[PDB]
Design a protein around this ligand. Structure first.
Ligand SMILES: CC(=O)N[C@@H]1[C@@H](O)[C@H](O)[C@@H](CO)S[C@@H]1OP(=O)(O)OP(=O)(O)OC[C@H]1O[C@@H](n2ccc(=O)[nH]c2=O)[C@H](O)[C@@H]1O
Lengths: 698, 7
């Protein structure tokens, strides 16, 4: 009955919580409430440890009570909001934050939380506004500061950049040492100059967040199989992803499940998300030996059960710390061997992950200390892409001569050859080899369709489509879900690129550019006097910010050209218009690397120390283009400048990429799968021999 | 949309 008794129990539970014994903190809070049920703060505290435990349904009930007892409890509103957000009720979470701010206009956390909703929604300027308000109200606020830092990064606001980075590092350093959870997200940690040890520790601490959520399930260790007898001589591999659908991950690996050899492997795909109806999902479902929809099994215990019950030997985490992940599944440890693969470009930092599948160029042995996992090397690159299957219409090109350039007016199509054979005057320039249509009436009709902005025309009974209009012609083709069934014209004029200039492209999201990268590029642009730099409005608000810094570096406006973000197929195809692609050294083009190389566009890169900054080098090594890999800033600029100034060297390198992209192992998904299969069996033979995981560096 | 990978 007694408020003082209950107050004491609350203090004793707050003590158990600090000592990390969550278990017992709850039992005490619950007892404080049984003594004095109208105890605002006990309800609030019980609620926020229930939230930690992932018991969201019940956490929310206690927050509601806390608010009922104490209506000015702005802190409780803000946290209730967080709970609603995690429950997918973004609408109602927003109402919590707004309602808190109204009760206490001075309450920083609610502002920061409101900013988070904005950030997630993609409205970045409104996210920035709120983060700044939070920081005005409470100037020492690591969560808000680091989130703001990432917003600013996203739009290329580099105001006080150097001072900002030093502060991030300092904030993280302090949080690690005081054992609180870092405010920098592991998926962002590659963007700031933290130590490698810090990056690993940030990941480690995100891994721990699962532990509390799985401990309340009280599950015993699972008993893993120790031979392949039950599974019929076949090794059972389970791919776990929230991205079996229209998502980069599927655009890279959709072909792999079907290519596993069924004599030795049984493939299980565990989808973490509902069927989005796209062909990517269709294909994996149809080709995996087993497809399991875990989105229907939202309890992590029952899902982990299902994995174990299927008898998986190697469970593959294709998500790391990206949206949709459910690492609780991996923490429950239902498979004897669990490997990170392809999806997340960094270490999990977690004890429940055994291997990271990588390669010698991406993660050389010198830097094995960056990863908590043991390195398991693929023989060439760990990276793969479905471009050979998705976009076969780009395996060959043809050009129109409008005066012999390989990238001014381009034609691709499955039936390109049959069309060209209907034409009278086609020259065949040697290298395969590239056809050149001369300035005819036919050439004139193609270029008039482009100029007048028309959808499509017919020539000799072949359909000729305007490259800018694919989604109107055949939307599934535009997305990469189908191969286009028409001939597609792609021209520089379409995107406002100068007909007679060296074009340097970078199609990544703008967040990957930092002030050094922009400096590097300005340097190249000054030295190659005709060049332009081709960038995307990704996102658009970044554009006026780049243009601004570009001018302080002394480049006129008309030297950097911005295009809108394109549908997948148009995006890949229009790389054919660039001369060279300059890769961001801070965080490489990954999927975007494969995309630009498929078009046969050479890419200059400067491999850093982090995984994310080494991928492009790795892709190029596998292609067999070591001359595009720079050791420093100076060498990067030099390679780029030579490529723009020496037109015979350009022609030569471009031709090398165009050929290598078929003949090397890079885009060869069958060979990749087989290599992955070798590496799986190695991992297994080792575990069956009774060993703990160790480096698989061959 | 054009889907990218996020945190
Ligand atoms: C740093 C990082 O997170 N890297 C990840 C890798 O580690 C993972 O292996 C990849 C698979 O999980 S995801 C990711 O790969 P990234 O290269 O960083 O590309 P990001 O995530 O921004 O997506 C761009 C998309 O926009 C498409 N894109 C781009 C421009 C355009 O006009 N149209 C378009 O479709 C591109 O084709 C893409 O489809």
């Amino acid at each position: 009955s007694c408020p003082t008794h209950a107050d004491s129990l609350n203090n004793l539970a707050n003590i158990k919580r600090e000592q990390g014994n969550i278990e017992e903190a709850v039992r005490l809070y619950r007892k404080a409430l049984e003594v004095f049920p109208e105890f605002a703060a006990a309800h609030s505290n019980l609620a926020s440890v229930l939230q930690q435990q992932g018991k969201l349904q019940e956490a929310l009930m206690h927050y509601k009570e806390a608010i009922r007892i104490s209506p000015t409890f702005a802190d409780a509103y803000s946290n209730m909001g967080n709970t609603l957000k995690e429950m997918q009720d973004v609408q109602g979470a927003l109402q919590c934050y707004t309602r808190a701010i109204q009760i206490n206009p001075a309450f920083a956390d609610a502002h920061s939380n409101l900013a988070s909703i904005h950030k997630d929604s993609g409205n970045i300027p409104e996210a920035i506004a709120s983060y700044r308000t939070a920081l005005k109200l409470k100037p020492d606020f690591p969560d808000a500061y680091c989130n703001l830092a990432h917003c600013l990064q996203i739009v290329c606001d580099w105001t006080d950049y150097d001072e900002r980075m030093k502060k991030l590092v300092s904030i993280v350093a302090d949080q690690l040492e005081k054992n609180r959870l870092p405010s920098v997200h592991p998926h962002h940690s590659m963007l700031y100059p933290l130590s490698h040890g810090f990056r690993k520790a940030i990941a480690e601490r995100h891994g721990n967040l699962c532990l509390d959520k799985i401990n309340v399930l009280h599950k015993p260790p699972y008993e893993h199989p120790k031979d392949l007898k039950l599974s019929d001589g076949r090794l059972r591999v389970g791919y776990v992803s929230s991205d079996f659908g229209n998502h980069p991950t599927s655009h890279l690996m959709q072909s792999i499940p079907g290519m596993h050899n069924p004599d030795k492997f049984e493939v299980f795909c565990y989808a973490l998300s509902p069927d989005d109806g796209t062909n990517f999902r269709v294909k994996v479902m149809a080709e995996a030996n087993h497809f399991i929809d875990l989105s229907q099994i939202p309890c992590n215990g029952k899902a982990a059960d299902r994995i174990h019950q299927d008898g998986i030997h190697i469970l593959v985490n294709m998500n790391g710390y990206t949206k949709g992940a459910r690492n609780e599944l991996f923490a429950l440890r239902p498979a004897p061997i669990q490997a990170m693969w392809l999806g997340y470009p960094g270490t999990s930092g977690a004890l429940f992950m055994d291997y990271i599948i990588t390669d010698q160029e991406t993660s050389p042995a010198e830097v094995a200390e960056q990863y908590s996992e043991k390195l398991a090397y693929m023989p060439h690159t760990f990276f793969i892409g479905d471009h050979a299957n998705m976009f076969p219409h780009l395996k060959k090109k043809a050009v129109i001569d409008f005066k012999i350039y390989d990238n001014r007016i381009v034609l691709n199509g499955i039936d390109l050859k049959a069309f060209l054979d209907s034409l009278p005057d086609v020259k065949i320039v040697k290298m395969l080899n590239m056809p050149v249509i001369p300035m005819n009436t036919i050439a004139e009709a193609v270029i008039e369709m482009i100029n007048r902005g028309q959808i499509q025309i017919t020539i000799n009974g072949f359909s000729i489509s305007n490259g800018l209009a694919t989604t109107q012609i055949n939307n599934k083709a535009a997305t990469g879900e189908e191969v286009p069934r028409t001939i597609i014209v792609t021209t520089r004029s379409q995107y406002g690129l100068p007909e007679d200039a060296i074009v340097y492209c970078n199609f990544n999201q703008l967040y990957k550019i930092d002030p050094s990268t922009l400096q590097m590029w300005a340097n190249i642009l000054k030295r190659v006097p005709n060049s332009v730099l081709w960038l995307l409005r990704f996102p658009a608000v970044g554009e006026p910010n780049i243009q601004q810094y570009a001018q302080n570096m002394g480049l006129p406006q008309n030297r950097i050209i911005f295009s809108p973000v394109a549908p997948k197929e148009e995006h890949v195809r229009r790389g054919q218009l660039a001369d060279v692609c300059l890769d961001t050294p801070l965080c490489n083009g990954h999927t975007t690397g494969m995309d630009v190389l498929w078009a046969g566009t050479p890419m200059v890169t400067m491999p850093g120390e982090t995984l994310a900054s080494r991928v492009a080098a790795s892709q190029l090594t596998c292609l067999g283009c070591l001359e595009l890999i720079a050791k420093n800033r100076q060498e990067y600029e030099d390679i780029a400048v030579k490529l723009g100034t020496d037109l015979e060297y350009l022609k030569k390198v471009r031709g090398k990429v165009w050929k290598q992209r078929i003949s090397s192992p890079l885009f060869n998904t069958k060979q990749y799968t087989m290599e992955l299969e070798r590496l799986y069996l190695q991992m297994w033979e080792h575990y069956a021999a009774g060993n703990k995981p160790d480096h698989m560096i061959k | 949309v054009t889907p990218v990978s996020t945190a």
